[PDB]
Design a protein around this ligand. Structure first.
Ligand code: HEM
Ligand SMILES: [K+]
Length: 249
C-alpha cells in the first residue's frame, strides 16, 4: 500500500550521487554493519497504531542517540556528517536509509529497492521500542509485529542482518561476531545458528528464539539451505522496514 511522493529531478540526482559516494565511503571505512544498524534503529521505532517513530531522521538528535539501545550509533552519525553535508538537498531520513541499503549492497547482499521522499520530523519517539536481546519469540512479535507491522517471515529474514558485524561489550555488553566472515553478506548467520555454538561466535537469546519457535524455525532452515531464498526475503523485508510510516505506514 505504498504511494511514494514526487521529488524533484535535482533531488533524484543527489540520491544517485549520494548512493555512489556512500558505497566508496562505507567500503573504505569498513563500517557497513554499523551503518546497517543505524538504518535499522532509525526505522525500528515505528508504532503502527499511533503512526509515531520510524525512519524520519530523528536518530541524529542527541535525545534519541542517548537511548541505551543506540549505544555506539553516535559514531555512525558522526562518520556520515561530512558526506551528508555534500548533499544538503537530501533529508537525513532518506540519507540514513540509503546508507543502510548501500551497507547491504557493498558487502555482497541483495539490491534493496530505494524510494526517496522521507521527511525529517521534529520529535523522536519515546525510548523503549527496539527489541531486547535477552527476550524471545513473543517479544519479537510484539516489537516487529504489533508495533512495526512486519510479518513473521520479515522477523527471521531481518534477523539475518546479523550476518554482518559484531557486538561490543562497551556498547550492548554482548561481544563478537555472529559469523566467521562479518563483512560478507551471506546466509552464514543461519548456518551457524543451526550448527551449535562455535567458539568465538555470538548467539543472542533473541537469535536462539528463532530455532525453537514453530513458525520461525522452518524459515531458518530454508535460509540456511537456500541463500537465494534468503536474499529475496531479506530484500522484501528491508525495503518494508526502511519504509515504515512512509508513503503509507
Ligand atoms: C531481532 C531482534 C534484534 C535484536 C535483539 C538485536 C540486538 C543487537 C545487539 C544487542 C547488537 C550488538 C550491539 C553492539 O554491542 O555493538 C546488534 C548489532 C547488530 N545488529 Fe541487531 N538486533 C536485532 C535485529 C536487527 C536487525 C533487524 C538488523 C538489520 C536488519 C540488525 C542488524 C545488526 C548489525 C548489522 C549489528 C552489528 C553492528 C556492528 O557491527 O557494529 N539487528 N543487534
Ligand atoms: K557473514
Amino acid at each position: 500500500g505504498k504511494s511514494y511522493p514526487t521529488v524533484s529531478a535535482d533531488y533524484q540526482k543527489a540520491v544517485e550521487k549520494a548512493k555512489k559516494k556512500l558505497r566508496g565511503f562505507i567500503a573504505e571505512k569498513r563500517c557497513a554493519p554499523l551503518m546497517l544498524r543505524l538504518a535499522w534503529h532509525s526505522a525500528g521505532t515505528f508504532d503502527k497504531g499511533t503512526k509515531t517513530g520510524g525512519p524520519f531522521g530523528t536518530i541524529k538528535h542527541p535525545a534519541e542517540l542517548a537511548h541505551s539501545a543506540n549505544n555506539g550509533l553516535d559514531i555512525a552519525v558522526r562518520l556520515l556528517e561530512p558526506l551528508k553535508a555534500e548533499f544538503p538537498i537530501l533529508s537525513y531520513a532518506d540519507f540514513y536509509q540509503l546508507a543502510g541499503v548501500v551497507a547491504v549492497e557493498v558487502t555482497g547482499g541483495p539490491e534493496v529497492p530505494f524510494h526517496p521522499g522521507r521527511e525529517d520530523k521534529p520529535e523522536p519517539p519515546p525510548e523503549g521500542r527496539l527489541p531486547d536481546a535477552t527476550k524471545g519469540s513473543d517479544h519479537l512479535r510484539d516489537v516487529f509485529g504489533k508495533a512495526m507491522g512486519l510479518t513473521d517471515q520479515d522477523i527471521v529474514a531481518l534477523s539475518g542482518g546479523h550476518t554482518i558485524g559484531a557486538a561490543h561489550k562497551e556498547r550492548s555488553g554482548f561481544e563478537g561476531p555472529w559469523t566467521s566472515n562479518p563483512l560478507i553478506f551471506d546466509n552464514s548467520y543461519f548456518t551457524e545458528l543451526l550448527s551449535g555454538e562455535k567458539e568465538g561466535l555470538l548467539q543472542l537469546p533473541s537469535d536462539k528464539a528463532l530455532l525453537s519457535d514453530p513458525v520461525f524455525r522452518p524459515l531458518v532452515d530454508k535460509y540456511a539451505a537456500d541463500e537465494d531464498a534468503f536474499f529475496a526475503d531479506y530484500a522484501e523485508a528491508h525495503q518494508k522496514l526502511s519504509e515504515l510510516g512512509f508513503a503509507d505506514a
